[PDB]
């Protein structure tokens, strides 16, 4: 609780970051979800149910692997990969989904809806709903259905309805808008399983609480394998769930640097990026007061990235607060930098990462050069790259 | 003292009718045509005009309004064009409130936007994604610049939240029938108005996707105002004469003796 | 041990299952590999290296999951899934590959070759070779390259060369033939990383020794979760590696039924199957004396299955021995049965299995109906279904 | 007392030459044509004929032989057709051995195949996928039905395994593969006086002559199949050229 927001969902004071910038039509169900979560987060039977699924279904704990063959590309620093790529469904998304799906059942909801960009949250949600016998509808931007088609097919096999969103940029922000519209209309029976650490209270806190396990495990593992706390912990930042998940356990370790890496696309100078902290500014978007990419009038600027999971012009409010506090540094990584790292990891360690995660790996390599020989850097390897194989093969001229 | 929109509702209630509240988005189909359209609403008997601020990600707008706001943004519409629209409405003898999502207001500056809206003759602000829980700055700016604050209530609203939302509102409370976009063609609306009347004497405007004289008349039996949006946009797309005719039919609907 | 073959590779004495039916041209390298294995299997450095990789890289142990929503489809029996699907690369193949790849490096070999049908062994081999910096060439039948195309692209991204084999049936047996010819020509520098529990000595024993970890984990896990040894342990059977891996630790528990399920394709009566034990007979094929599908003159009959991994007319010699002894029963499962189970596992447990593994699940459902309420059945869930999503979506009309 | 092929190699060694050993697969392009081709080899001066048994998965066969055996199998060739081929060769005055992968022999019955091979006038068996380590049944059948047993050695063969393979062979040793062939023949000569045949993808007269300088036999197969595919006259011409090659 030291790092938690107030009862209104605000970080850093009464007007700060987060809150609930939603219509009154959603407030009954938002208050219903908030009350249900406050009740269940302190119920041992709930935590036991979540733990049992984490262990036996999802295969936790995920291991921590020292990628020694990266060292020479990282200034002889020691890169440790936190292997969320090995989870059921292939990403960290399943952690949050199991929690929220269990909560949906506890609340008596019969229908679950979700947004997805990379399709990993969509697949995770479909997975949990199949497991728990819930009806499932996934909203996905039309551009994303085409570039993450493996995940569309998986969702469909799992019994989910997939709705391709054609509005706006046809990517994650637009999928979120449609899912929101569904929830407004169907609040009585429908639970909205939100997939990142953004949105109105209680979502930033709840999503973060279910992703905390990553950091809790990593903090124990790194002390065991390296003999000490790391010099840095790093992750990629879409809306912010995998990053906040791994960071949280190290917040009160003052010697541990925390670095989030955001998608810079073609470059921050080009206007084709998703570098929210580098190029954005404070505003109200998708339920929260946080940073977003916006023009002089406050219109959302459409994001671009080769990574569908980082192609989002906003970011979660806890990250905005941590940025303002000076606790986390957030830095841009381009498409090219990320793909170089994607390729390097395949070639050197035999791990095919998600293109999202390759941004974190790319950032870690640069940080390694900065910190130098023997520095211990823990990297959240948020997911695997099966969905991205076609894109990557094309990038590297392998068909 | 009294709300800015108080005299309009008192005047309507004295003539045994509801207020006709007409929505158009600034910049559709372009900025000059939209201003001409809003002027036409004043001339055709709209008691209050909701000047819509086009937003890039309008979660509560229906398809008709969403396509129109997209088109306005492609045309290059700006937030200050909405302030110009309010001026033109005020000059024509009309009464304007602005409907906007919150971020354009934050970006402009809450105090500054309230100041400039009031300077243009604007009477208040309708805030579909701002709940009273987050409205501290807006409440202060609203009191300082003498602007009405129209929050929304929904059928799902709990007793506590409904009471708190009505208490926080000045001018009127917008009750709507849930899903995004103007209503198009159920006892939810009279029930919701009924719940607002049980805790307060503030006027209640009702939005239900109204498209015809008959629907406006049904709503005027129980509501103090009839809110129309989607159908006005559809009318304007066909032409300015079609808008004048529709507005005239709705103006007849709100009157009932 | 009690279950090992003699120094010539023969199981069961004088019947002679196994052995070495190879040309003299291969015997120098076969004897080289045999000697290197015997040396390294008792070297603590080697076992430490293998262990470190299994834990931190591959993510072992895999969990054991009670699939309670399957129970009503299995006579109210209790189906426990041994989750090899959650391993790095998505199957059991990685277990054997890390062992053999480490061994290749110990021997000073500079080039690794492998056959693949489903593409999982190919991907695992490529993975290990990336990790250890070995040149890699994978042989894959042309029909398999088409129906497991996701794995071809993964192999290529991992830096492996892939050679499409167009001879014979253009499936696993033909890939094996080509890899064999490569080894014959390039024995001095090349290690053959054989992916199943068949072939000449030492491969059946060595592959099984590296896969034994599955059963050893399962035996401990089931006693922990269920409070006793299972009533049965089951697996699908291609060449036999995942089956022998999970079975081995239960061989000396006399109350534990062991059932292998082989691919029956369109049905055993149709001549379009891979049901080696059901329809085959003893013979020498691919280096061993074991069972194979063969005609009256001893010509290999081409196998057929919807599953690329089980589409092999042979089977490993240790299985032939266990069948002869009456320790394991081997039963046919058709394409249709397997796909029904595929779909069921998706809908009930949110797990997308490999079509290979779906055969084992289908068999488990039938065995559950035989054994009845409360019977404890451990099923080896050998792989995940990423590679099969297109096939399955097409099967279920989901496009 | 002595091997079945011993008198052939002694007769060659007395005429200061190597034996020409010719391989054709039974049933290519069909069964009657293949027998007519094998007869042509006897007439064109092949000292020994290797009658190939087409196998469905021939691991050691190169592309030319593999495609021919595939074609023979499509045509419906049977193991008995090989025994008929051996008989036709023997009646024509030729000397035949059978080359086969092991499973067809197992299926037939090892003893029964030996018995029937011997009754057809067959002199022995070449076994590319049978090492002595697995050859217990074959050794017994070989001794009983008086058949030569030609095992293969390779450049990679260890000293111990080379010795064991040569010791287990009767008739000749098939040395299969730059300077590798003469070196391998040299290593067999150092432990035994058994004849050594060399197979090296021989295509021409000059190549057969080079091999005849050190080897007791020159084995040709791929080139004979290629010749037969063009025509039966082309096979005669090539076989006659190779016959001249071994006499230098
Ligand atoms: C947006 C989606 N994924 C984001 C994602 C991210 C970025 O999202 P975070 O919420 O910042 O963790 C990182 N890694 C992987 C493997 C991802 O799939 C999605 O799948 O719906
Ligand atoms: C033949 C190959 N796979 C076989 C396979 C099998 C059958 O192979 P076994 O050797 O019987 O375990 C089972 N499960 C999965 C997931 C598989 O991929 C291959 O990928 O090369």
Numbering used by the authors:
A (entry chain B), C (entry chain D): 9 to 407
B (entry chain A): 8 to 192, 196 to 267
D (entry chain C): 8 to 184, 196 to 266
The study reports:
Tryptophan synthase, composed of a heterotetramer of TrpA and TrpB subunits, catalyzes the final step in tryptophan biosynthesis. The α-subunit cleaves indole-3-glycerol phosphate to indole and glycerophosphate, the former diffusing to the active site of the β-subunit where it is covalently bound to l-serine forming l-tryptophan in a PLP-dependent oxidation/reduction reaction.
We attempted to determine the structure of Mtb tryptophan synthase complex bound to compound 2 by X-ray crystallography, yielding a low resolution (4.0 Å) structure. The resistance-conferring mutations cluster at the interface between the α- and β-subunits. While mutations on the β-subunit dominate, the mutation α:D136N is situated on a surface element of the α-subunit that covers the substrate tunnel between the α- and β-subunits. This density patch is clearly visible in 9 of the 12 α-β interfaces. While the structural detail revealed by a 4 Å map is evidently limited, the location of the difference density, its consistent appearance in 9 of 12 β-subunits at contour levels distinctly above noise, and the immediate proximity to the sites of resistance-conferring mutations, including α:D136, clearly support the interpretation of this density patch as the inhibitor.
